[PDB]
Design an enzyme around this catalytic site. Structure first.
Site, short mmCIF file in Angstrom:
data_model
loop_
_atom_site.label_atom_id
_atom_site.label_comp_id
_atom_site.label_asym_id
_atom_site.label_seq_id
_atom_site.Cartn_x
_atom_site.Cartn_y
_atom_site.Cartn_z
N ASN A 46 0.86 -1.21 0.00
CA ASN A 46 0.00 0.00 0.00
C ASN A 46 0.90 1.25 0.00
OD1 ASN A 46 -2.33 -1.64 0.01
ND2 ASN A 46 -2.07 -1.98 2.20
N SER A 50 2.00 -0.13 4.50
CA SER A 50 1.30 -1.39 4.87
C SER A 50 1.30 -2.35 3.65
CB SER A 50 -0.09 -1.12 5.44
OG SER A 50 -0.94 -0.63 4.42
N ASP A 101 -16.48 -6.11 12.32
CA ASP A 101 -15.84 -4.88 12.89
C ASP A 101 -16.80 -3.69 12.80
OD1 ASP A 101 -13.40 -3.56 13.90
OD2 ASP A 101 -13.17 -2.71 11.86
C1 LIG Z 1 -9.98 -6.09 4.89
C2 LIG Z 1 -8.70 -5.61 4.27
O1 LIG Z 1 -7.61 -5.71 4.85
N1 LIG Z 1 -8.83 -5.03 3.08
C3 LIG Z 1 -7.73 -4.54 2.28
C4 LIG Z 1 -7.69 -3.01 2.37
O2 LIG Z 1 -7.39 -2.49 3.66
C5 LIG Z 1 -6.62 -2.48 1.44
O3 LIG Z 1 -6.71 -1.06 1.33
C6 LIG Z 1 -6.79 -3.05 0.04
C7 LIG Z 1 -5.54 -2.70 -0.70
O4 LIG Z 1 -5.83 -1.74 -1.62
O5 LIG Z 1 -6.93 -4.48 -0.05
C8 LIG Z 1 -7.89 -5.05 0.83
O6 LIG Z 1 -9.14 -4.74 0.24
#
Ligand SMILES: CC(=O)N[C@@H]1[C@@H](O)[C@H](O)[C@@H](CO)O[C@@H]1O
Ligand SMILES: [Cl-]
Ligand SMILES: [Cl-]
Ligand SMILES: [Cl-]
Ligand SMILES: [Cl-]
Ligand SMILES: [Cl-]
Ligand code: NA
Length: 129
Positions: A46, A50, A101
């Site tokens: 990300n 992350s 959640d």
């Molecule tokens: C439930 C979960 O972790 N979802 C993630 C989200 O947080 C993240 O932004 C995305 C990446 O773009 O992939 C997933 O959809």
């Protein structure tokens, strides 16, 4: 491991996702198809630093520990590597906490943009379940 569609449906059903918090099995299979293309080994970094892990692309910002997301949480209490296993148990148990959640399946951006309000039953059509 790259799952076939019907193989993943059966695995998700065995692990208690069919109608978990009101979300039919097709929703989960659709979410996995667009998040990972059914690949348990899928990773994506990300913009914030992350990383998303596994068949349901669960995010290290909140849900799992990868040792390299400063200030993040580990709300599923697992190493992110456990979400890359051929066995989907860790991904399913974490998916259950996520979808409970408050925001339901809206936590999965691909589900919101590609599955939500579509004929999700097509993803389990023809499968022995
Ligand atoms: C439930 C979960 O972790 N979802 C993630 C989200 O947080 C993240 O932004 C995305 C990446 O773009 O992939 C997933 O959809
Ligand atoms: Cl497919
Ligand atoms: Cl369905
Ligand atoms: Cl970290
Ligand atoms: Cl499995
Ligand atoms: Cl909901
Ligand atoms: Na984390």
């Amino acid at each position: 491991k790259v799952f076939g569609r019907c193989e993943l449906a059966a695995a998700m059903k065995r692990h208690g996702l069919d109608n978990y918090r009101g979300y039919s099995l097709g929703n989960w299979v659709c979410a996995a198809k667009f998040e990972s293309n059914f690949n348990t080994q899928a990773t994506n970094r990300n913009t914030d630093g992350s990383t998303d892990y596994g068949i349901l692309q669960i995010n290290s910002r909140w849900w799992c520990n990868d040792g390299r997301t400063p200030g993040s949480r580990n709300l599923c209490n697992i190493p992110c590597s456990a979400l890359l296993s051929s066995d989907i148990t860790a991904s399913v148990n974490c998916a259950k906490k996520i979808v409970s959640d408050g925001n339901g399946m809206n936590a999965w951006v691909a589900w919101r943009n590609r599955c939500k309000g579509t004929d999700v039953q097509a993803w389990i059509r023809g499968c022995r379940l």
